[model samples]
Target: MTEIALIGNPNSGKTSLFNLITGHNQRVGNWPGVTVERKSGLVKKNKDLEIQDLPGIYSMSPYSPAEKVARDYLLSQRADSILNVVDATNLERNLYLTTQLIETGIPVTIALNMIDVLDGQGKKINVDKLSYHLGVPVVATSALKQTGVDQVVKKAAHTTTSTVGDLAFPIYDDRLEAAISQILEVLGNSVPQRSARFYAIKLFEQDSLVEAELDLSQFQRKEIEDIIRITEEIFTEDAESIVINERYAFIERVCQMAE
Candidate 1:
């Protein structure tokens, strides 16, 4: 069986897209630290597919509670690939997080959704060019019209794993990088081999849940905290802030070049 995760920013028509893909097949439950329940569904009526609608948030930096839930779920091993629900109407802002998603080292398909709204605004989306430049498959979709939902799932199901360049958790400065390495060195072989780099970066960012993925002793956790302290002292911002700013900066560059 394959798992698919649906992620996007708020007001990007995520729930409508979710309903279109899964119809009445979804399940709802609250996530930790929030009353806003998680809504997930099984699309396509196929037993081979599992779909989750991660809580909508602005960015994946754990800046917001909902975003933390989203970040946690995406990094989990249970998921295979991601269907990034980007609003074609608001490409610039949506792509901010899209760039971050590409860094998670998972296959991503961009669902350039809500073109009807864009057309209403007298704008048109050049999805082929957008997809080509973004380095992911882009599918134009309108959830309200219930169009192209199945194709989104089919493409998501068929996607093969590959790497994206400059896709590491947004680049940090040398001090932070040294701090990150210190934590990784202490963590030793306890981290999963497939996800050590990702985990190392996340741990440096003080991702508690990600750290929980590995069994770390009190000494290891404390060492991580000390390194993060050094990182914060030098950068004067938490790791998440450093990465988020770097990602947004890169996203600006991508948009400018793509334009």
Candidate 2:
């Protein structure tokens, strides 16, 4: 069955976007994880089109177990496509995950969300340039106000791989890049083929998500332990802290550049 998955950070208007598209035609379920809400509904026009509102995750590199459930499905299960609903006001942080999602090679339609708030702030966005750079269909939307919701879904249904977006990451220095590469190598051995980087970043961040999802036997666990020891000897902090620090440092740099 064709499915459209709505994935984004909490407060990115995910539920709001889901409601705008599904209206009253939906079902709510408790996923196997926690009490966090998961909603599914059918498009009124197309029975074949199922929409799932996964739990909110701040990033694809699962930080909390609550996030891992959502992240795992989006990254590995390979849903039909995703509505990468992002807060327009919080574009910089939101774009971090957007870049990671593009790396997954999944079809993504970006809901450049929270235009109403940006409008209230008297701000304007070059959404055309933003979308062109991200290589995804972009729709400026306000879920509470219910504007541009249809455009978001319409774009999700018709994604083409013909485009290559030219967006670049906040540059990481050599030390941080080497650290990330090392963790990625560890994850390649521990996690699924398609999801190594996702797990690597999560582990790098000391995320609660990796704790729940990653399982290594006593021997393999000990081997990873040894690798971590070596890493700690080279860097002052453990693998997770270094990773988190790198992303934060990158975010600060990006903010300064944007300013």
Candidate 3:
């Protein structure tokens, strides 16, 4: 059996897609320290596929208990690949989280949900262009209409083995780019290659959760801190904010290309 997790922002039509994928084979429970309900079900199209639908979240940073649930689940890598349900109407905003998902090194398939809504609004998204820019498969879907839903699931399942096409890598500023390269070298095989980039960014952000989970010596810790300090001093902001702003900037550029 294979496992697939659905993740996205609030009001991105994740629930609708989940329902369409699982039909009645679903269950819900609350995450600890928060009342945010966790949903999971078996995909009817393949008896071997199990889907876990995470709570909608804006970012992976655990600023709130509810957000922590999704953050924990994602960083834990409990699912084989992620079905990122994105609201096509709000491509820019939805891609904010999508950027982070790509960094996780986990196979991701963008379920561009609510394409019909965009069609009704006289807006059109170039699915191929978007996929090209993001380096992942982008499948158009309208969960409510049950249109293109199965394709999203199948795409997600296939992504676990390999990306549908070229994999997109977001661009970063020179300093950040240099820092990521240095950190990746330091992290050498400490984590999977797919996840090295994500951990590198998290280390720059001074993410405490990542700090706790990774085994870092004093020398390595000091080296990462130096990079963080340099990035902060260069950007005139905290490392975390610098990363966030840059991610949004990249998303903005990609959204324009997607248009």
Candidate 4:
């Protein structure tokens, strides 16, 4: 079965899209060990498809309960694909989450929800160009009107079984790439090749959660610490800020093209 996790920012019409996709045919429950709400359902129209509703989050960092749960699920690599329900009207802010989602190595399809709202605002997005840069389908969807909803699911399923979307989309800068490659060398054969970069980026930022999960020896840990220190000295900021800033730089270029 193909599983697509539905994720988006708060008020990005995530719940609306889930309703449209699953049509109240859902099993509502709490996220494991947490009171945060959870919902999932097999798409009624397609028995082979499963849609999971993850908590709304701005970024993948474990800064909040919701964000932790969202990041944890994707880190577990349970979903076959991610149906990113983005608010088209608020492109910049919504794409912030999209940037992080694409880095997870799972195939991602942007729902681009609220296209009608963008129309009402007398604006439009260059979907094809955006799709080209993200290396994923950017289907215009309005769960409110139920238009283009099915196409997002079909795109997700198509990419779920077919590989190559992840590597096509380049992220991070040259210096950061150097550090990531170093981390990759240290991580050789430790994790799946597909998720190695994802883990590398997280480790670059010194993500405590990811470090806790990875079984790195003290010597390797010292090496990554030196890598982060080198980067931090060059950027004059914490490792996380360097990553966050570069993400915006990439996002800005993508938005510029969509203009």
- lDDT tens per residue, model 3, 135-252: 8889999976789999988888888834334445687888789888988888888777767888898888888878888979888888888877877787789887888889988888
Off by over 4 Å in 3: 25-35, 161-167, 233-238
Per-candidate Cα lDDT values, in order, are: 0.70, 0.67, 0.80, 0.79
Select the stronger candidate by lDDT from 2 and 4. 4
> How many clashing pairs in candidate 4?
0
The whole-model C-alpha lDDT of candidate 4 against the native structure comes to 0.79
Error of 2 at 64 (Å): 8.2
Give the alpha carbon lDDT tens digit for every residue of 88-112 in model 1. 7678889887866765667788788
Q: Which scores higher on TM-score, 2 or 3? A: 3
The worst-scoring run of ten residues by lDDT in candidate 3 lies at 26-35
TM-score of each: 0.69, 0.70, 0.87, 0.89
Which has the higher lDDT value, candidate number 3 or candidate number 4? Answer: 3
lDDT for 32 (candidate 1)? 29
Question: Which residue pairs in candidate 4 collide?
Answer: none
* Root-mean-square deviation (CA) per prediction: 5.1, 5.2, 3.4, 3.4
Model 2, which residues run further than 4 Å from truth?
25-35, 44-47, 59-72, 75-78, 92-107, 132-137, 159-172, 186-190, 206-212, 217-238, 252-259
1 or 3: which has the higher lDDT?
A: 3
Q: Sorted on lDDT, highest at the top, how do the candidates line up?
A: 3, 4, 1, 2
